[PDB]
Amino acid sequence: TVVVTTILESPYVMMKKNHEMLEGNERYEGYCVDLAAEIAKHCGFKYKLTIVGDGKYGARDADTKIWNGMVGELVYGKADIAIAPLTITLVREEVIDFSKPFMSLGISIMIKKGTPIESAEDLSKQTEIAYGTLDSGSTKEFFRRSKIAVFDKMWTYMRSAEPSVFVRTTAEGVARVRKSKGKYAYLLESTMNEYIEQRKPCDTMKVGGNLDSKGYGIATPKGSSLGNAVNLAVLKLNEQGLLDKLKNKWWYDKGEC
Numbered sequence: 001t002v003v004v005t006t007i008l009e010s011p012y013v014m015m016k017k018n019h020e021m022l023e024g025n026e027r028y029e030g031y032c033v034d035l036a037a038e039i040a041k042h043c044g045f046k047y048k049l050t051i052v053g054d055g056k057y058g059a060r061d062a063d064t065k066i067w068n069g070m071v072g073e074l075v076y077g078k079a080d081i082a083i084a085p086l087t088i089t090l091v092r093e094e095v096i097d098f099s100k101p102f103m104s105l106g107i108s109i110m111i112k113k114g115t116p117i118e119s120a121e122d123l124s125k126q127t128e129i130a131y132g133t134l135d136s137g138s139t140k141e142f143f144r145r146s147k148i149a150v151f152d153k154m155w156t157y158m159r160s161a162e163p164s165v166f167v168r169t170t171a172e173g174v175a176r177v178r179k180s181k182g183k184y185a186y187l188l189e190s191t192m193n194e195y196i197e198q199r200k201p202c203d204t205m206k207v208g209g210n211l212d213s214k215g216y217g218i219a220t221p222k223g224s225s226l227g228n229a230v231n232l233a234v235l236k237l238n239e240q241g242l243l244d245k246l247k248n249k250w251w252y253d254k255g256e257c
């Protein structure tokens with residue numbers, strides 16, 4: 001039985017309402033729950049879903065150099081594969097292998113409906129509406145390291161805006177957009193931004209083109225006997241139209257807006 005690490009992040013993995021009456025994999029539902037079943041079928045393995053102990057994706061402490069999250073669970077042997085919306089990045093790929101992406105995404109803008117902002121350039125050319133990102137992570141780093149004039153102007157503003165425009169969690173970023181009466185715009189992954197829009201009170205919108213391009217991938221340890229098959233399975237499901245189908249199902253068929 002393959003041990004699958006994953007993360008409770010909607011709509012990827014969520015507890016079914018009647019989870020206490022159930023056990024094992026049946027306790028969960030979501031895009032990644034459906035994906036794990038397809039990947040297992042196509043690779044021929046039995047598996048057990050487990051939620052990542054510390055509830056994190058995967059980052060390496062700059063001082064201690066220890067890996068936390070799902071990446072940590074793979075490099076320290078606690079799980080055999082990670083099936084979740086784990087972004088394919090250079091630092092992670094140095095230590096684990098990623099399948100080809102199963103979903104595309106990029107940095108985007110979340111506004112409270114009615115905010116007169118349509119792009120990153122709009123935001124950079126004004127100060128009435130504050131804007132920020134998660135206070136740690138790649139989105140913040142994107143701006144910090146960018147050489148593009150608009151993005152550098154945005155970084156300059158954000159780094160010294162008061163009150164602080166950075167938030168501790170994704171949920172706080174969403175709540176701040178919702179409760180700031182149009183005076184705060186949040187930068188985050190387009191997939192989450194698209195998902196919010198679609199969730200009641202239906203008061204947020206995704207605007208502008210993505211500012212970068214990335215992808216989520218299934219992760220396995222270096223030398224894993226699972227890597228090759230998992231990678232072919234993702235390509236097959238994309239070509240059969242199944243990945244698009246799952247995305248449409250969890251974002252729109254189950255949408256409320």
Ligand SMILES: O=c1[nH]c2cc3no[n+]([O-])c3cc2[nH]c1=O
Pocket residue numbers: 009057058085086087088137170189191192
């Ligand atoms: O560092 C990460 N950060 C992530 C933040 C996310 N917010 O909404 N979804 O879905 C997310 C997926 C993420 N995946 C990552 O690997």
